[PDB]
Structure 1
Amino acid sequence: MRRYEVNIVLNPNLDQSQLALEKEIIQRALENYGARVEKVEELGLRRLAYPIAKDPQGYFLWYQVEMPEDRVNDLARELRIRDNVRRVMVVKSQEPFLANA
């Protein structure tokens, strides 16, 4: 198992009806490939630097699983087929290299 991070910026104009309805699919696929929960942050709405998917705002969903390598890419295939999921960036975890600390 390798430690990864799964940034997800989805539709800001989403209600708590489907919001939780999309966070179940995410958890589904996540654990359907092997991802294992850990330090998770749901910062929420934020004004993107540039208009994305037509909208000038995004709802961020940062995670930190630890799934099987040869699966990761698949964990990204089915994680994008959603329509409210407008961005998926999974990137391996790496001890924070400080500087000027």
Structure 2
Amino acid sequence: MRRYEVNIVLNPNLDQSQLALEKEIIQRALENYGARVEKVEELGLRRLAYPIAKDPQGYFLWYQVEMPEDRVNDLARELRIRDNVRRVMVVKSQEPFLANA
């Protein structure tokens, strides 16, 4: 098992009924794919650098996991299914390279 980082951006127009549903669906997919979550950072409403889905903003999610490596692209395919889910980028974790130290 290697360590990854999940970046999910979804439609920033949801109420709490649809937001909790989208996120507990995200939690449901991580259970089926075996991603032990280590920590979470939620930014949410953030000003985008260009229009995405005609919408000037996005709601940002970040998860840090440790999961089996073979099931990565299957997981990426499982998250783009939801209409509200717009951007899915998964990156293998890396060391914090410092500059001007």
Residue in structure 2 matched with residue 10 of structure 1 by the alignment: 10
Q: TM-score, normalised by structure 1?
A: 0.97
Bigger fraction of residues in strand:
2
Partner of 2:73: 73
Measure, in 1, the Cα distance between the counterparts of 2:98 and 2:77.
33
Partner Cα separation in structure 2 for residue 31 and residue 99 of structure 1: 37
Q: CA RMSD in A?
A: 0.7
Secondary structure at the counterpart of residue 48 of structure 1: strand
Tell me, in whole angstroms, the C-alpha distance in 2 between the residues paired with 1:36 and 1:54.
34
How far did 1:14 drift? Answer: 1.0
Aligned-residue identity in percent? 100
Q: TM-score, normalised by structure 2?
A: 0.97
Distance across 2 between alignment mates of 1:85 and 1:27: 14
The CA deviation at 1:19 is 0.3
Aligned residue pairs, count: 101
Residue 31 of structure 1 and its aligned partner are, at CA, apart by: 1.5
Cα deviation, residue 22, structure 1: 0.5
The alpha-carbon deviation at position 39 of structure 1 amounts to: 1.7
Q: Which runs of 5+ in 1 are unaligned?
A: none
Q: Where do 5+ consecutive residues of structure 2 fail to align?
A: none
Runs of 4+ in 1 over 4 A off after TM superposition: none
